[PDB]
Design an enzyme around this catalytic site. Structure first.
Site, PDB file in Angstrom:
ATOM      1  N   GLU A  10       0.772  -1.282   0.000  1.00 11.64           N
ATOM      2  CA  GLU A  10       0.000   0.000   0.000  1.00 11.64           C
ATOM      3  C   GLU A  10       0.808   1.342   0.000  1.00 11.64           C
ATOM      4  OE1 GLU A  10      -2.774   0.131  -0.733  1.00 11.64           O
ATOM      5  OE2 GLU A  10      -3.316  -2.066  -0.609  1.00 11.64           O
ATOM      6  N   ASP A  43      -7.000   5.040  -5.957  1.00 14.21           N
ATOM      7  CA  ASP A  43      -6.398   3.711  -6.005  1.00 14.21           C
ATOM      8  C   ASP A  43      -6.305   3.230  -7.438  1.00 14.21           C
ATOM      9  OD1 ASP A  43      -8.890   2.618  -6.585  1.00 14.21           O
ATOM     10  OD2 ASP A  43      -8.714   0.925  -5.124  1.00 14.21           O
ATOM     11  N   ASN A  57      -3.617 -21.145  -9.992  1.00 19.76           N
ATOM     12  CA  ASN A  57      -4.988 -20.797 -10.081  1.00 19.76           C
ATOM     13  C   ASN A  57      -5.217 -19.288  -9.739  1.00 19.76           C
ATOM     14  OD1 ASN A  57      -7.941 -21.288  -9.328  1.00 19.76           O
ATOM     15  ND2 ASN A  57      -7.167 -23.294 -10.121  1.00 19.76           N
TER      16      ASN A  57
END
Length: 164
Positions: free
Chosen positions: A11, A20, A134
């Site tokens: 962050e 963002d 995955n």
């Protein structure tokens, strides 16, 4: 390393409202302001001034920064632990891998993470290599692949090597 360290890494810190990756107002260490189309940067500072408890003119201080950061990290935990399909892996996980899991929830939230159907199995089954695959098969990996890497590596090896 530990969660705060990880997030503080992923962050970054910024005292002035910004957008963002989504184009959402965020302030501080990943603090999410609001996702409504109704607000602009300036109006979103109202929401802020509320949480902050003072007019900020959309600017906070390192401390307020850190203040909400904490409140943020809790809430995700809060998340994980409320969810019928999160709490299991969380419990399934070790102290470092949990820092991985949480990180995600702090990025997309409760709901959006739980949506990682097969992975959550796979990773509770303690099936690292597959799991880590995955996951790379995601919009997520697609939006912020960098951040997605470190974590994915995290869930893979079990350490903070990725955090170097």
């Amino acid at each position: 390393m530990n969660i705060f360290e990880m997030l503080r890494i992923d962050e970054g810190l910024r005292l002035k409202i910004y957008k963002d990756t989504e184009g959402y107002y965020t302030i501080g260490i990943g603090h999410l302001l609001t996702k409504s189309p109704s607000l602009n940067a300036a109006k979103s500072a109202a929401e802020l001034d509320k949480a902050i408890g003072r007019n900020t003119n959309g600017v906070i201080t390192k401390d307020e920064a850190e203040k909400l950061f904490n409140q943020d990290v809790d809430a995700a935990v809060r998340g994980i632990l409320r969810n019928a399909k999160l709490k299991p892996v969380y419990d399934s996980l070790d102290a470092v891998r949990r820092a991985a899991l949480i990180n995600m929830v702090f990025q997309m939230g409760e709901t959006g993470v739980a949506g990682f159907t097969n992975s959550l199995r796979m990773l509770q089954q303690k099936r690292w290599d597959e799991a880590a695959v995955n996951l790379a098969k995601s919009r997520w990996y697609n939006q912020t692949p960098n951040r997605a890497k470190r974590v994915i590596t995290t869930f893979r090896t079990g350490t903070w090597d990725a955090y170097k």
